Paper text:
ELKS proteins play a key role in organizing intracellular vesicle trafficking and targeting in both neurons and non-neuronal cells. Rab6 is an evolutionarily conserved Rab-GTPase that associates with vesicles and regulates vesicle trafficking to and from the Golgi apparatus. As Rab6 effectors, the scaffold proteins ELKS (also known as Rab6IP2, CAST, or ERC) in vertebrates are encoded by two genes, Erc1 and Erc2, expressing ELKS1 and ELKS2, respectively. The ELKS proteins consist of an N-terminal intrinsic disorder region (IDR), a middle long coiled-coil region and a C-terminal Postsynaptic density-95/Discs large/Zona occludens-1 (PDZ)-binding motif (PBM).
Using high-quality samples of ELKS1_RBD and Rab6BQ72L, we crystallized the ELKS1_RBD/Rab6BQ72L complex and determined the complex structure at 2.04 Å resolution. In the crystal, each asymmetric unit contains two ELKS1_RBD molecules and two Rab6BQ72L molecules, which form two essentially identical complexes with a binding ratio of 1:1 between ELKS1_RBD and Rab6BQ72L. In the complex structure, Rab6BQ72L adopts the typical active GTPase conformation with a bound GTP molecule and ELKS1_RBD consists of two α-helices (αN and αC) to interact with the switch Ⅰ, switch Ⅱ, and interswitch regions of Rab6BQ72L. The two helices in ELKS1_RBD fold as a helical hairpin through interhelical hydrophobic interactions, which resembles the coiled-coil conformation and explains the monomer instead of dimer formation of this predicted coiled-coil region. The binding of ELKS1_RBD to Rab6BQ72L involves both polar and hydrophobic interactions. Specifically, four pairs of charged residues (E857ELKS1-R84Rab6B, E869ELKS1-K13Rab6B, D871ELKS1-R63Rab6B, and K905ELKS1-D49Rab6B) form salt bridges to stabilize the interaction between ELKS1 and Rab6B. Among these charged residues, D871ELKS1 and K13Rab6B are further involved in the hydrogen bond network connected by S868ELKS1 and Q65Rab6B, which further strengthens the binding of ELKS1_RBD to Rab6BQ72L. In addition to the polar interactions, several hydrophobic residues in ELKS1_RBD, including L864, I867, T908, and M912, pack with the hydrophobic pocket formed by the switch II and interswitch regions of Rab6B. Compared to the other Rab6 effectors, ELKS1 occupies a larger surface on Rab6, encompassing not only the switch regions but also the interswitch region. The extended part of ELKS1_RBD interacts with a region outside the canonical effector binding site, specifically, the residues L11 and K13 in the β1-strand of Rab6BQ72L, which are strictly conserved in Rab6 family members but not in other Rab members.
Residue numbers in the entry:
A (entry chain C): 849 to 919
B (entry chain A): 8 to 175
The structure:
Amino acid sequence: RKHLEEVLEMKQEALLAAISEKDANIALLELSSSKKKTQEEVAALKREKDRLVQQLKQQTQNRMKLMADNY
Amino acid sequence: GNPLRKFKLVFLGEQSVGKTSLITRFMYDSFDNTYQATIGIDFLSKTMYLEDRTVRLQLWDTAGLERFRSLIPSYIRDSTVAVVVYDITNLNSFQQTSKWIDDVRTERGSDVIIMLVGNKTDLADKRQITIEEGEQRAKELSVMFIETSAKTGYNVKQLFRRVASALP
Ligand SMILES: Nc1nc2c(ncn2[C@@H]2O[C@H](COP(=O)(O)OP(=O)(O)OP(=O)(O)O)[C@@H](O)[C@H]2O)c(=O)[nH]1
Ligand SMILES: [Mg+2]
């Protein structure tokens, strides 16, 4: 159980950094979004951010399901 | 034109004290009367402009429901700022902020900015903790302090401005 916990923690840490960096990149482009091409990249990064946030939610549900087993 | 930095803020507190409502008021200038408990953890963000700096505030909104409790230390470790919220009509929620703050320091030590928030000031007839007791508790734990109402908006913008002005 301690071993499974170390594995899940490392995978979540990768995901939290990816969410934060994806969001940081959105904020950067939004500063100078004075162009049709820029908002199109912003829209795509926002799609990618939602996808990552959704993965985190599902990883969280899996994490609690696997913690509810016997070791 | 200025440099942009990101900073992560984790919102902590007993269930139903108003963590999400503070965020909804800051993000959407709205208030939801119907309680919708946070299931697990949620992510929201907003850019703030400051003299010679721009900050991207990234918010981990955590659930107060006890079943999610063991997931929260991960988000405290991920965050440089902790917003610990209680309900001014609810003495137990205030007492528990000592535990929340102690958990923050277990994960971050001194490498963290902590804001203690007494929310729901609009429920003045049901107040169980004075503003003085909150101010003195915060001084004793060496944290920042503010009272807010997510319902009326009182001090909600000031909460995030004061946190943003405290960042490196
Ligand atoms: N009068 C008043 N009610 C509030 C205030 N803030 C929140 N509420 C109400 O309190 C209830 C809880 O609000 P939430 O923002 O969902 O609280 P929470 O801390 O995020 O709860 P959990 O996610 O379950 O941990 C809701 O019914 C809100 O409408 C406030 O400032 N004043
Ligand atoms: Mg909530």
